[PDB]
Design brief:
This is part of a larger assembly, with two copies of chain A, one copy of chain C (about 500 residues) and one copy of chain D (about 475 residues).
Chain A (H helix, E strand, L loop, with lengths): L5 H5 L2 H16 L4 H20 L2
Chain C lengths: L1 H18 L7 H23 L15 E2 L3 E3 L4 E2 L3 E2 L1 H20 L9 H18 L4 H10 L3 H10 L11 H30 L7 H4 L9 H11 L12 H8 L2 H10 L2 H11 L4 H27 L5 H19 L4 H32 L17 H12 L6 H16 L1 H7 L2 H16 L18 H19 L2 H20 L2
Antiparallel strand pairs in C: 1-4, 2-3
Helix pairs in contact in C: 1-2, 1-4, 2-3, 3-4, 3-11, 3-15, 4-5, 4-6, 5-7, 6-7, 7-9, 7-10, 9-12, 9-13, 10-11, 10-14, 11-15, 13-14, 13-18, 13-19, 14-15, 14-17, 15-16, 15-17, 15-20, 15-21, 16-19, 16-20, 17-18, 17-20
Chain D lengths: L4 H6 L1 H19 L3 H24 L3 E2 L5 E2 L1 H25 L8 H16 L5 H17 L10 H27 L15 H15 L10 H8 L2 H25 L6 H19 L8 H20 L7 H27 L22 H15 L5 H15 L3 H24 L7 H22 L2 H10 L2
Classes of the chains: A mainly alpha (about 55), C mainly alpha (about 500), D mainly alpha (about 475).
InterPro entries (chain C): NADH_Q_OxRdtase_chainM/4, NADH_UbQ_OxRdtase, ND/Mrp_TM
Enzyme class (chain C): translocase
Protein name (chain C): NADH-quinone oxidoreductase subunit M
């Protein structure tokens, strides 16, 4: 059961989660400029919402 | 197998060695001989652990 | 006085080797040997000239030599180099290991060799600077800059840019696993200084006034975990040690001498010097977690050592078993236990350095790394396996070696303070025997027909045998006669223990 | 107030550079020569650096209600001038191979220097607008310089529509604040009703496009791949260095920035900027997109200091030194990229897979990229580490635990791609102003090394400048 080292692998999951979450964020980028402006509107929406809950 | 088994006995032997230094301080055999009854006026229960594990 | 010079010779030598690289190519080997000779001369001069047998109860501030210099005056960051007794043992050890590193790299000419040696002196000088460090920022800066040049060693010299396994797994895990925890202890340093700045009203980064800063309970505990995380990824502790076998199995064995014999020292040095005295009640609360992690480390490293099939990862997994004794030693209230840790620690370096030199020596003899592939080389080699038998014998608690007195005074002090976790701990000696014999029987005992390449074997040169003979005789004198260095470290160990006792 | 000689000595940076545009434009119409125009433009920018001493003879004072001249603005004008000096020295070797009209380049960079040195001096909301747009029009047009490629025009058009869009958001926000307050002067503003805060959020949108913040960062890859490398030196360093000064001064002076309603929103943007930069930055195999990805994370570290500007006075010098270190690191790295394109070469072929070797091709230039690339990360012996260290101290000082943790884990994530480029310059291999371009990046390498090991003299300059 110790032919492969368990705790080295189970504390590598920060790197696994970071790399996979980084790949998802790269896939979130598109290149189509309409969604860039939609990102600007949706940042304005959340900033005003986050300011009105304060 | 002899090497593994003799070191199990040596762990058992060193256990009594820790206990003798904790209880009677000096490990010299003769000084131990006439120091053992001086230190053992009150408690004796733990000496069987020392001696059984020495055995 | 001597301390600025004694941390700067490694950096001066790297500049001069790279300067004379244009002049010649056989120069930096001979330049490097002399420069490390000067390092040991100043280190041994401090051993002999200084009052190594000083007063056992001269307070927590006590130093044979001390340097102060303003570096960044806005926070009081100063070059506060100051040498204690046990710190001087560390300096002399790394000077000797530096001589071995530059001797194993002899007759190793490449496309560039001055670059290798300026990096070699840079990393060894970084370890010296950690060992002489009382200011917290200077300690942290040196702790993190000895960590950058080994990455270039594993990258450009793990193998010369042919296979991608020498960077993207081995060297990268080595770098990240240390630096994330280094930043953790930096913010731990800053939280401690800020609570001291609220208490008194001065921006100071010095150890003496941060030593007794008033902190409420439940606050210094988090900072003690913050210090211990950076001190648990450098010496191999149970949750975070995956970098060690990869680092030792890929770097050249001279880089492995640096990576094992002396980088493992500085974390327990910091546990003795910077973590224990600053946080007495937090460490008293954290003690049993440390004992549980210590016993788990000894048993875990031996099992993983028994189960492994190669040699560099084999000795790399002995190291994690060895350091568990040291961690249990530090987290107890006994003077004898700490003095056992020091002799065990010096012997740990001396018993890992010879094995790594010889494992690299065997590989370049046979051009085969896997242990189970060979076997029965005793009829072929004339001096390698006999000397290797004693080093494998010195790994476990065999008397006449320094490791026995080291591990075993820890056990005396450990049973003095707490019975049940010590009686579990002693069984690692039986497990130390089984992986020691596994190494010996799989490598050297058997028939030479186990491998085809075990039928044409080279000879062994004089200087490697000279530097192996010196280590075996040096390690035997430490096992038989360990009194001189224990008399050296008594007062430093004593005041740390008295402060840990009296401050609780 | 009227014009006094104190005002003219204070205005001397905006004046020397403007006189340079006129002389450069007359020289273009006279001869249309590359050598004379490069010499005339660099002399004017060097004359602006000399005249920084003369405004240092003048104290902290106003010129008009639009501008306030302090010693803070002295340092920011200097950062912008060295970036303009840096971009013209990197453009001559790239433009020698350009086919025609090789002389409009320095005219646009000079206009952008006017815009940069106008956002250093700010006291009214209108000067904020005269500065943003003065620098954008050269950056509208210089990423489209050499439009003969199929991607420079692509990059110019994407940046053009988006930058006009941000300016329209900034202007609409700028008025919705002035509806409540009687004046648009930064100081006079705020004298927490929702319309003022709502107007403030619109200015954050219009400012966070150019500062490359998290929901506005989409332009920073594409134009950095499309633009010429001489333009990328200016677009990475000078624009955001100049822009960060005015957005810091607005929150320092305005009492509305003291309130926690804006503070929480900017902190979340800073949190997400670090994360959404340093995770998508790993997979890139292009050096220009790689530097553009790192720019988002560097402006995020600047924001985690800026949120704690209002708690402790150490944030002023912290922002200043990280900007100085960030200037030197990016100029050295982008200069090596541009110095590999010693002719025009049409489309330059630069990639992380194209940078195998490069030590046995050109060893000195590989050393500069490695030193700067380790300086971007947080490795010590480099000025980036001291800048990283102050932003950690500022976050510790203000008890922003999530934000300082984000910097550390962002540093932990972002170490990976910097190190690959540092080692990829060591794998197996697959004119006079060029020597001058090499001298500029080599000079920067010496500076970042000596100010990482020995960082006190740069702090003395910064505390000299801060009021």
């Amino acid at each position: 059961l110790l032919k492969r080292d368990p705790l080295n692998s189970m504390m590598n999951i920060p790197a696994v989660l970071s790399r996979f979450a980084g790949k998802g964020l790269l896939l979130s980028e598109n290149g189509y400029l309409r969604w860039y402006v939609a990102s600007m509107s949706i940042g304005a929406v959340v900033v005003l919402a986050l300011l009105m809950v304060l | 197998k002899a090497f593994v088994v003799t070191r199990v006995g040596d762990v058992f032997l060193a256990f009594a060695l820790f206990i003798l230094y904790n209880e009677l301080g000096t490990l010299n055999f003769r000084e131990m001989v006439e120091l053992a009854p001086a230190h053992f006026a009150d408690g004796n229960n733990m000496l069987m652990w020392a001696t059984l594990m020495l055995l | 006085m001597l301390l600025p010079w004694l941390i700067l010779i490694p950096f001066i030598g790297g500049f001069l080797c790279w300067q004379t690289e244009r002049f010649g190519v056989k120069v930096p080997r001979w330049i490097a040997l002399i420069t490390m000779g000067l390092t040991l001369a100043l280190s041994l001069q401090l051993w002999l000239q200084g009052g190594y047998s000083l007063t056992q109860s001269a307070g927590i501030p006590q130093w044979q030599s001390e340097f102060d210099m303003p570096w960044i005056p806005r926070f009081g960051i100063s070059i506060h180099l100051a040498i204690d007794g046990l710190s001087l043992l560390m300096v002399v050890l790394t000077g000797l290991l530096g001589v071995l590193a530059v001797l194993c790299s002899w007759k190793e000419i490449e496309k560039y060799q001055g670059f290798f040696h300026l990096n070699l002196m840079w990393i060894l000088g970084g370890v010296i600077g950690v060992f002489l460090a009382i200011d917290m920022f200077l300690f942290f800066f040196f702790w993190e800059m000895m960590l950058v040049p080994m990455y270039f060693l594993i990258a450009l010299w793990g193998h010369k840019a042919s296979d991608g396994k020498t960077r993207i797994t081995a060297a990268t895990k080595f770098f990240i696993y240390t630096q994330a925890s280094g930043l953790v202890m930096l913010i731990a340093i800053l939280a401690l200084v800020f609570v001291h700045y609220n208490a008194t009203g001065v921006w100071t980064f010095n150890y003496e006034e941060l030593l007794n800063t008033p902190m409420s309970s439940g606050v210094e505990y988090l900072l003690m975990l913050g210090f211990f995380i950076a001190f648990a990824v450098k010496m191999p502790v149970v949750p975070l040690h995956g970098w060690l076998p990869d680092a030792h199995s890929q770097a050249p064995t001279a880089g492995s001498v640096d990576l094992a014999g002396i980088l493992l020292k500085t974390a327990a040095y910091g546990l003795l010097r910077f973590s224990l005295p600053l946080f007495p009640n937090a460490s008293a609360e954290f003690a049993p977690i440390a004992m549980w992690l210590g016993v788990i480390g000894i048993f875990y490293g031996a099992w993983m050592a028994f189960a492994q099939t190669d040699i560099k990862r084999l000795i790399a997994y002995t190291s994690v078993s060895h350091m568990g004794f040291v961690l249990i030693a530090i987290y107890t209230g006994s003077q004898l236990a700490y003095q056992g840790a020091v002799i065990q620690m010096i012997a740990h370096g001396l018993s890992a350095a010879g094995l790594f030199i010889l494992c690299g020596q065997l590989y370049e003899r046979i051009h085969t790394r896997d242990m189970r592939m060979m076997g029965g080389l005793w009829s072929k080699m004339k001096w390698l396996p006999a000397l290797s038998l004693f080093f494998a014998v010195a790994t476990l608690g065999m008397p006449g070696t320094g490791n026995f007195v080291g591990e075993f005074m820890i056990l005396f002090g450990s049973f003095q303070v707490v019975p049940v976790i010590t009686v579990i701990s002693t069984f690692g000696l039986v497990f130390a025997s089984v992986y020691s014999l596994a190494m010996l029987h799989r490598a050297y005992f058997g028939k030479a027909k186990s491998q085809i390449a075990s039928q044409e074997l080279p000879g062994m040169s004089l200087r490697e045998l000279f530097m192996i003979l010196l280590l075996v005789v040096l390690l035997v004198l430490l096992g038989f006669y360990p009194q001189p260095i224990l008399d050296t470290s008594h007062s430093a160990i004593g005041n740390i223990q008295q402060w840990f006792v009296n401050s609780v | 107030m009227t014009i006094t000689p104190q005002n003219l000595i204070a205005l001397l940076p905006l004046l020397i550079v403007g006189l340079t545009v006129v002389v450069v434009m007359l020289s273009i119409a006279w001869r249309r020569n590359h050598f004379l125009n490069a010499t005339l433009s660099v002399i004017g920018l060097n004359a602006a650096l000399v005249s920084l001493w003369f405004v240092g003879q003048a104290g902290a004072m106003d010129v008009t209600p639009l501008m306030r001249v302090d010693g803070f603005a002295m340092l920011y004008t200097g950062l912008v001038l060295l970036a303009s000096l840096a971009t013209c020295t990197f453009a001559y070797p790239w433009l020698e191979g350009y086919n025609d009209n090789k002389d409009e380049f320095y005219l646009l960079v000079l206009i952008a220097a006017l815009g940069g040195i106008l956002l250093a001096n700010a006291n009214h909301l209108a000067s904020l607008f005269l500065g943003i747009e003065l620098i954008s029009l050269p950056l509208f047009g210089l990423v489209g310089y050499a439009f003969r490629q199929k991607r420079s025009l692509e990059a110019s058009i994407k940046y053009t529509i988006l930058s006009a869009a941000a300016s329209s958001f900034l202007l609409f926000g700028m008025a919705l604040v002035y509806a409540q307050s009687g004046d648009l002067s930064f100081v006079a503003l705020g004298k927490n009703e929702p319309l003022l805060l709502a107007g403030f959020g619109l200015m954050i949108v219009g400012l966070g496009f150019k500062l490359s913040l998290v929901p506005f960062h989409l332009w920073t890859p594409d134009v950095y791949q499309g633009a010429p490398a001489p333009v990328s030196t200016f677009l990475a360093t000078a624009s955001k260095i100049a822009i960060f000064g005015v957005v810091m001064r607005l929150f320092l002076y305005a009492p509305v920035g003291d309130s926690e309603a804006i503070r929480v929103v900017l902190a979340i943007i800073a949190f997400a900027s670090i994360i959404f930069g340093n995770l998508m930055a790993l997979s890139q195999t292009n050096i220009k997109r790689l530097l553009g990805y790192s720019s988002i994370s560097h402006l995020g570290y600047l924001l985690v200091a800026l949120i704690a500007l209002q708690t402790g006075e150490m944030s002023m010098e912290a922002v200043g030194v990280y900007l100085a270190g960030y200037l030197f690191s990016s100029l050295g790295a982008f200069g090596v990229v541009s110095l590999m394109s010693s002719p025009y070469r049409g489309p330059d072929a630069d990639s992380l897979f194209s940078y195998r070797g490069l030590f046995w091709h050109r060893p000195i230039l590989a050393a500069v990229m490695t030193v700067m690339m380790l300086s971007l990360a947080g490795i010590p012996m480099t000025l980036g580490f001291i800048g990283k260290f102050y932003v950690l101290a500022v976050g510790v000082q203000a008890h922003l635990w999530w934000l300082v943790g984000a910097v550390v884990v962002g540093s932990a994530i972002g170490l990976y791609y910097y190190l690959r480029v540092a080692v990829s310059l060591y794998l197996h291999a697959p004119n006079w102003q060029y020597s001058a371009g090499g001298i500029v990046v080599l000079i920067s390498a010496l500076l970042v090394l000596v100010l990482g090991v020995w960082p006190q003299p740069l702090i003395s300059i910064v505390r000299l400048a801060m009021p």
